[PDB]
Structures are given as structure tokens and as C-alpha cells.
């Protein structure tokens with residue numbers, strides 16, 4: 001699968017992160033990201049996808065070595081960490097045709113794993129509207145500890 005790039009945008013307090021909600025298969029909440037184009041550098045893909053989905057341009061803020069990367073079923077997703085973006089920033093996607101909504105979420109309130117169904121004696125995980133964000137939350141929490149305190 002083709003790598004994806006995007007961003008974890010945080011506010012000035014470092015409390016909140018910016019998530020986007022799509023439609024249909026992409027109906028839950030996730031960090032803004034998308035598929036790399038042929039010959040496109042990871043940093044340009046991230047900025048491009050973030051600008052398409054949020055209307056916010058990260059290019060002046062990207063730091064080359066500040067990202068979290070996960071390989072999930074053989075697909076690499078790398079989210080550059082972009083702290084310090086004011087909470088009153090006005091975000092608007094390129095088309096409401098892909099992005100339903102854009103919101104800040106408290107990091108401490110977001111799940112960092114899904115819950116099983118052990119009270120129901122059933123295998124697997126309960127649905128969670130943050131399932132695409134979830135795999136980045138523990139690594140982000142740890143990364144913020146190691147770079148801010």
C-alpha cells in the first residue's frame with residue numbers, strides 16, 4: 001500500500017489535537033492525512049493533505065524529524081507533529097464533499113486503545129469513532145513527554 005502523510009496539530013496548551021471527520025468509510029474521526037503522489041516528498045504530501053482537508057497550511061511549521069510513523073497492515077502512515085496552533089484558528093476543508101467536520105479534541109479524553117467486549121463474552125473490539133486516531137495517541141503522549149516534559 002502507498003504511504004500516507006499528514007499531521008497531528010496541537011494547540012498552544014498542548015492539551016488538544018485537531019481531528020477531521022469524513023464520510024462513508026471515512027466517517028469516524030482521524031488525523032488529516034492522505035496518499036503520497038508519485039515523486040512527491042513526504043513533507044509536501046503532508047502539507048498538501050492537511051491543507052486540502054483543513055485549509056490550514058503547515059508548510060512554515062513542519063519540522064523534519066518531528067513525526068510519529070506507524071505501519072498498519074503493511075501501510076506506512078506518518079504524521080508530522082505541529083504544536084502551537086491557536087485554538088481560534090479557522091479551519092475549512094477544500095470540499096465539504098470529503099470532510100464533514102473539523103474539531104479540537106482533548107488528548108487526555110481520547111482513548112488510546114479500543115475496549116473489548118469481555119462483559120459480553122464476545123471476541124473482538126467495540127466500534128469507536130476514533131479508531132483511526134487511536135493508534136497514534138499513546139505514541140503522541142510519549143513523544144510530548146520526551147520533547148516538552
Ligand SMILES: CCn1cc(C(=O)NCc2ccc(F)cc2)cn1
Nearest residue numbers: 020021022025026028029030033132
Ligand atoms: C477507511 C478507514 N478510515 C479512514 C478514516 C480517516 O482517515 N479518517 C479521517 C479522515 C477523513 C477524511 C479524509 F479525507 C482524511 C482523513 C476513517 N476510517
